[PDB]
Amino acid sequence: YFGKLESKLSVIRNLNDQVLFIDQGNRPLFEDMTDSDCRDNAPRTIFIISMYKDSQPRGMAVTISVACAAASTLSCENKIISFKEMNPPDNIKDTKSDIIFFQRSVPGHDNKMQFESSSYEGYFLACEKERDLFKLILKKEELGDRSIMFTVQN
């Protein structure tokens, strides 16, 4: 079971420094932005990372939600990334949840983080180019895959 402990405003970047944002259609995407542009787009770029205590410690347990949104919490249900219409809950009774990820520092890589699904072991949040877009996906982990590494500014 998980219990919510604390929350921090966060900006998330992939390894090419593209900023995670939520677009008009509620999709999580990455794009290039100058800090001035990131500030100007604060409502679409500011996330809340909420840390939870876990009765079965396996890594820093977090939800990721949109700050300037009524209720948009990141989910990997069915191995598909979406925002569900809910807030980070105070308690979660199960040992796995489609909205809980384990945030882990990457050994040997300065300040980088990975986010592993609590529901689907060995699956991580990743940035994947599709057509001309860079999208947030869930994918299975080759060692040192840079597409599953992020910087978190808080």
| 50 neighbors 88 (Cβ within 8 angstroms) | yes
26: left (phi over 0), alpha (psi -120 to 50) or beta: left
Q: Which of 42, 47, 113 is nearest to 33 (CA)?
A: 42
Partner residues linked to 74 by β-bridges? 83
Count Cβ atoms within 10 A of the Cβ of residue 127 and give its class: 0-12 exposed, 13-18 middle, 19 or more buried. Answer: buried
How far is 58 from 103, CA to CA, in rounded Å? 10
**83 contacts: CB under 8 Å, gap ≥ 6:** 22, 26, 28, 66, 69, 72, 73, 74, 75
Domain ranges of the chain: 1-154
| 113 neighbors 103 (Cβ within 8 angstroms) | yes
Buried/exposed code over 9-29 (b: 16+ C-beta within 10 A; e: otherwise)? ebbbbbeeebbbbbeeeeebb
Count Cβ atoms within 10 A of the Cβ of residue 82 and give its class: 0-12 exposed, 13-18 middle, 19 or more buried. Answer: middle
The fold of 1-154 is: Trefoil (Acidic Fibroblast Growth Factor, subunit A) (2.80.10)
Please report which residue ranges of 34-137 form alpha helices under DSSP H: 35-40, 42-45
